[model samples]
Target chain A: KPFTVPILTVEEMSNSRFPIPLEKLYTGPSSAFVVQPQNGRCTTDGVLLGTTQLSAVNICNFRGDVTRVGISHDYTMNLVSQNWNNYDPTEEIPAPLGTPDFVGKIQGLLTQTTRADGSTRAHKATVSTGSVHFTPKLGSVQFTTDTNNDFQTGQNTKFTPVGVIQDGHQNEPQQWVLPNYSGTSGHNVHLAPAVAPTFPGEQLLFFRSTMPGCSGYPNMNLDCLLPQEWVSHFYQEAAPAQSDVALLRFVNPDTGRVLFECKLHKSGYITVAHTGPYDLVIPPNGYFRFDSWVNQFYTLAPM
Target chain B: SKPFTVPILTVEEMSNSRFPIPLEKLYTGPSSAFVVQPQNGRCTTDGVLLGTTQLSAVNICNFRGDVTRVGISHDYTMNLVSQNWNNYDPTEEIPAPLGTPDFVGKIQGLLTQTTRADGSTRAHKATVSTGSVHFTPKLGSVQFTTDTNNDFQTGQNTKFTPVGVIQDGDHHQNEPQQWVLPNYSGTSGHNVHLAPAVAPTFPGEQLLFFRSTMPGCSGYPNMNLDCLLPQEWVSHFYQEAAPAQSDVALLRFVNPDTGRVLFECKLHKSGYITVAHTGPYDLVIPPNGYFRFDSWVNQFYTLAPM
Candidate 1:
């Protein structure tokens, strides 16, 4: 052979400039399942829940819900109007006594569900059913169920929510106001999200006396305005306790309640709807807590 | 149209997705001699004497042939024949192996068989008739062979000068390729459109680019039009280059095997290339595989599995 065999020496990971061989990078006996890292980013910033670093917010590519929000009071989720334009509702259809008017959903649905002849009516759970449901309202009256499915199915649902909109800059579409647990959360109040005339890029400076959110904080209760509690959280992040994950189900860990799927959309939005439940194993996913002893499930409209 | 969906049965037994997939990707291989192979097909694609595209595309492709390209005449000590490789390029040597973002080499050569009058050599240069010739389990049965040169009957030798190592280029990726389209594809039928938003799963997509010119600029100092790169492909992104030089480099995601083009477009000048193939067809990997793209362009670009 005319060529000389060049040789290289191996060293430790920290000081070694050379790449770690493939044999060392795999787990199985074969060559499949290499832990390759991803190198593309979606946006400069969006919404991030839990421990993942804050700068690069993600747009969800692979779908399935990512996070959920829960509040403890009960209210009817009426589909107000896609009228991000019109505001006045014929006060003729009044906010139930002790209720704030609420409504919203895209594809302009104004029913408990969008399907014609669909039978799903608004769920009516009171605080006693361990049903703390819903987060964020659209036009004061519209709310969505924690139904994590992307509403792909046109079923009749009620009390669903207006997704927790990521307010890009203050004055962004939809502002978030924490329920003043001190008073009847928005009770006897006018419904903003429930009634529209919403201006483009408009997020009215909504909350007050509550911890001003963002730049590293926990996600809190929305429409718990109807729940009458904000001092308490809907779901807690599996923080120092766990790192950030794409989505997590907030449960009481052992023997507590397991509610709907809670998703923090990689697309910078969040969905908390009522869905079927699965017993959660603690070590792996630390994601949800939406049910409040107060708001979500069903309720009795004043007789 | 019964209000909701009533299942006649359920979906087919196991309908899931395939993948794109490998090329864990010549991820930042060795800074040098990471790949080695014989352009003449003496070795497999990722070196290791034709190792499965290599049991490890992740491992550096050390395609250093026991062969060298440059040579002086053995008798040339008396004939004053010639210096096999020139030492003036500052970064090249005779028989110098070429490098890509995914491969590195030492003395790799694509030496054509040609020479001149004064170059008429009296003897073949120093040669190593190295490699294997054992009968395969069948002509196409063997998956691997070591140090065996499948190419036979080749005699090219030389008395060579070893000028140490001339670092020609390092294996690089995301080497910048420009893309500028007048605009984007039409908003036609997305559902039954021309292509799929994502490839099916396995046999996914394979994205690789070969720019004849790389990470060096046209001139000096800041002369770097920055065309020069490691794949100078280190920084791959859909950045808006100047209006003029930004000729849209439409890198296509192709099916080398079936010869089907899955998706192709320059990294968005500012549009959805995904919109290109709205839904008609798609891509795959595994079984007979393909590499998926992390992105068309970025700070770092690689063909990974979807």
Candidate 2:
């Protein structure tokens, strides 16, 4: 014989007697749509739930690379639940990105439409069919794709070099010139070029100038020399050590071409490497400009 | 004629000369001009009528000018008879109320000589020939004779003795006659009583001094310390002196040119008084100069040598 139970409406079950059988409960999807959780949490236990949904689908697929990420609507809901639960210790949940809910909702919406797997067929179709196109503007780099992926996976699949974000490594270890250079007596000399290759987990490049008035060169001189074009990489990596040195990049302005991208450290009396073997000269003062692209769909716009 | 030495007479003098001659000419007859013979006249017993017998002449003698020289041979009884004189003894007398003899009495007696008490005399002859009398009707004249000889000479003083018999006799004569005869007898006969001459005295002293003491010194002379009396010195010490005396002292202090007392001090001497008038030896004095004691002495002197 099979056990049987009577079904109840949501209102009746809300006030039903305790210890009611599970089969008698109305367990269908709630009429109230699920609101997407914030980046922090989406359950009463302050644990980030993986299967929560959004009340309304929001799409932010504008054509610029992402420069900075702001919190979204989903992030706000998670923040409230986590704050109510005091971040329950009983739950073993992944830490949320803690992004603003409004910003996260827009990001989620874009992520839902993006293609996770890399495929050029959808992109080519998008270009031919005039589905979505990209155009680069000042301070921003745009993207277009036939596949519905705006940024989540397909857009991120493309890696484009924008520009570097350099930081002043003021705390790095430094060394003086072999023989200090004195500005007096008109005996100043430039520095020499020496390269420092990037090591594993090290993102920074450093270079230092040489000291002059030594055996080879009189009148001690040391100076760090940078090429006309360079990009500073600031990913999650170990930083380099060396003061009075700098990172650089070799770029061809006319062809928009990039060459051996590396950092160089100089150790000599003076007179660094010359850039005139080709028709290369330092860009006219203030002529070298670049844009910063943060992640996949945002870029810092020009002021 | 010596061309009459006189310059041309002024127009007024010439006009005056033609003004009736001061004796208008008129018809002379038995009742025009006459002589009033002094007989038993009440006033003029021995009258001397002046002027020659002429037309329209009444008696004008014993007035204005010399007119008299009469003598009585004896004390004989007589009367004044007007003979052939116009208005002789007329209802209006010659001087209206006074008769001819009374009109003649107005003549001032001309002085002849001055006599000393010792009987010595000097004479003053008359400048004109006759004495005349003129009636003024308002004032009548009574004949006055010299009771004690009267003298009239330049600088020969006389004592006025008025002798007259009239209703207002002698009273009117006192003031004028006293002025004329300033030297009257008072106290001693040698001490002639007369008004003192005026002069400025110095240093608060009474400005009364005998002219005999000063002699010929008169008329704004420089003040002398010798003339400063003891009373004047005391008065000056008491500030009673006039400012002129102080001014004199100041002037003397600057320039003691005259031999006057500039400063003096009384000193002791046996049986007699002594005075000193010394100054600083550096004083600049002229030859044969003398010191004067008439200024602030101690203020300008010191016992020690400078």
What are the per-residue Cα lDDT tens digits for candidate 1 across A1-303?
A: 111100111110000100111001100111122211111111112211211111110100011112222342223332322211232333422221122111111111111323342222222111111112321222233223323333323232322111112112223112122232113333323322221112222111111111112111212111111110110011111112111112323443455544333332222222233122212223222223422222122231211
Question: Over all chains combined, what TM-score does candidate 2 have?
Answer: 0.10
By lDDT, who's the top model here? Answer: 1
**Model 2: per-residue Cα lDDT over B1-306, one tens digit each:** 111011111111110010000111111112012221211111100111111111111111212111122242211111122321112232321222221222111111122222223223221111111112212221221122321232322232221110111111333311111011111111222212111221222221121110100000111211111111111111112221122211122112112356443322211110001122122122332322322323322212321211
Over 4 Å off, model 2: A1-303, B1-150, B153-306
User: Taking the candidates in order, what DockQ does each have?
Assistant: 0.02, 0.00
Would you list the C-alpha lDDT of every candidate in the order shown? 0.19, 0.18
Tell me the RMSD of model 2 versus the true structure.
76.3
Candidate 1, after superposition: displacement of residue B110 in Å?
64
**For model 2 chain A, the run of ten residues with the poorest summed lDDT:** A14-23
lDDT of 1 at B222: 12
